[PDB]
């Protein structure tokens, strides 16, 4: 039988608990906020990316715009350069991460993702392109920029670019080719012996086609065959919404239907060479 209480261990524990509860309350206040999202949308808004640049925005990234005739505002990627030019980007290819075999509604409404860094693939949506490019008495321009698999880039410019309403199947229109070292694939290409191939591969005045909404000049279905949505003729010489091929080079054996269905621009590279990157972007013509 021994007589030792000690018991300071008990009281020292109670005090250690009361102090621990203080530490626990302090940790709670540090775990209230969510994960920080690197993706933010800018505050400045306007009719388009040029209007936004005119209001003093200097950074390329994500912005809401609302053309006058638009019922609601919508998000876009704006490219803003050191000279106050604000490009509204409506198409981007970069790495093959997004499937471009999409239907009429999907091409109408848009698909893919928008990034502040401009490092994502997307189609903005035909309805939006139509709204931006048909603002009352504001001539627009389109720039197509292409990158090959060896880091070379080229461009093609089209003056008075317009995309028509859904009632005219989002018809592509422009007044003239305004130059650029990629050449004018929208004028079609003289591929071979057939005297009508250049006429049937041009894109000016072509209605938009998807697999489920065929508005091309072919007995068959260009968009279904080539797995895309595009302003098809019979069928194409520039085809930026085509299948992404790693390394550029592909062949008839690469495809289910036997046709050139890659990301092509026939005036710059053979139709069996598929671009590493493409950008389709629009700006008021007077900025050029």
């Amino acid at each position: 039988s021994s007589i030792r209480y000690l018991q300071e261990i008990y009281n020292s524990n109670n005090q250690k608990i009361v102090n621990l509860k203080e530490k626990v309350a302090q940790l709670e206040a540090q775990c209230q906020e969510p994960c920080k999202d690197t993706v933010q949308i800018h505050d400045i808004t306007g009719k388009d990316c040029q209007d936004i640049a005119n209001k003093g925005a200097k950074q390329s990234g994500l912005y809401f715009i609302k053309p006058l005739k638009a019922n609601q505002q919508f998000l876009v990627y704006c490219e803003i350069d050191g000279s106050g030019n604000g490009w509204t980007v409506f198409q981007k290819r970069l790495d093959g991460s997004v499937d471009f075999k999409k239907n009429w509604i999907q091409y109408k409404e848009g698909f893919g993702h928008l990034s502040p860094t401009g490092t994502t693939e997307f189609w903005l949506g035909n309805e939006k392109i139509h709204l931006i490019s048909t603002q009352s008495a504001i001539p627009y321009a389109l720039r197509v920029e292409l990158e090959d698999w060896n880091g070379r880039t080229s461009t093609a410019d089209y003056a008075m670019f317009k995309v028509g309403p859904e009632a005219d199947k989002y018809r592509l229109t422009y007044a003239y080719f305004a130059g650029g070292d990629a050449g004018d694939a929208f004028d079609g290409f003289d591929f071979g012996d057939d005297p009508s191939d250049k006429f049937f591969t041009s894109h000016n005045g072509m209605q938009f086609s998807t697999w489920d909404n065929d508005n091309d000049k072919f007995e068959g279905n260009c968009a279904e065959q080539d797995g895309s949505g595009w302003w098809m003729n019979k069928c194409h010489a520039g085809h930026l919404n085509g299948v992404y091929y790693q390394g550029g080079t592909y062949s008839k054996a690469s495809t289910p239907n036997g046709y050139d269905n890659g990301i092509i621009w026939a005036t710059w590279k053979t139709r069996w060479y598929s671009m590493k990157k493409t950008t389709m972007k629009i700006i008021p013509f007077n900025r050029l």
């Binding site: 000690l6 690197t38 990034s115 994502t120």
Partner: protein
Amino acid sequence: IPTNLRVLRSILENLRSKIQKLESDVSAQMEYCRTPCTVSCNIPVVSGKECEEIIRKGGETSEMYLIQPDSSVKPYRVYCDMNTENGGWTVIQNRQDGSVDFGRKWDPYKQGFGNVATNTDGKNYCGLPGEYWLGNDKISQLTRMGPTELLIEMEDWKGDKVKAHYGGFTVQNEANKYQISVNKYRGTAGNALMDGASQLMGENRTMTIHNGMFFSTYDRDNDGWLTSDPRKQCSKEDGGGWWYNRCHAANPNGRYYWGGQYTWDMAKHGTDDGVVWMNWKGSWYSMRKMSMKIRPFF
């Protein structure tokens, strides 16, 4: 009596080493919280008033989307479930891992809290939902746009699951204390919201019906108990915000107990404050997964 200073000495020496371990654990986590977790949720091009319009516009994958219910409302992020049933589901509540504190005050429940979505593997978009509460102002606005249905789904720790579908669902505004109404029940989880707890009877069951209740948080008492003492509150400190009566048959916003089973002596205030659906598992089982999703009714 002689063999009493043996175990009673080792019990206290066990506890003091347990306080040292907890002291270390809390401290280590505090260092981790010097910097936040991050996401990079690049935004789908496709948008609409909510997730139903989005799926009608061809947005067919479950992920984060930006929606703008009204031109007067600032566009905001939500997780859209495009795969469950017919898709078009706007997630308003989600629990899956206890990564978010749901024991929050009135303003956080008003504004929304938690993580809408996170990045999966090496993808440049957020296709996995986080734990979050969308926010009462936003939930009220969405349900009041037109007839709205509600899908509540839950899963236990063995992988079994049930659901509670309410064909009609409305949440009134702040002025009306975010009052809830539900009807047209069907499912497997049991009609906790309309019928109260299935294990109770009479008055005691009736006082667990959530239908018609106001929202309360632990700093804003709007529950069924009208007694003027701070001891009688359904939502106590670090308790979830919910449509409490006296008090509940269900609390999706309860505390996340790991493993499911918990007891009164594990609970902060000795109450059944877990992620509960009494009509399925009882008061002392805490769900592994719990979520709430709404959609325009057709």
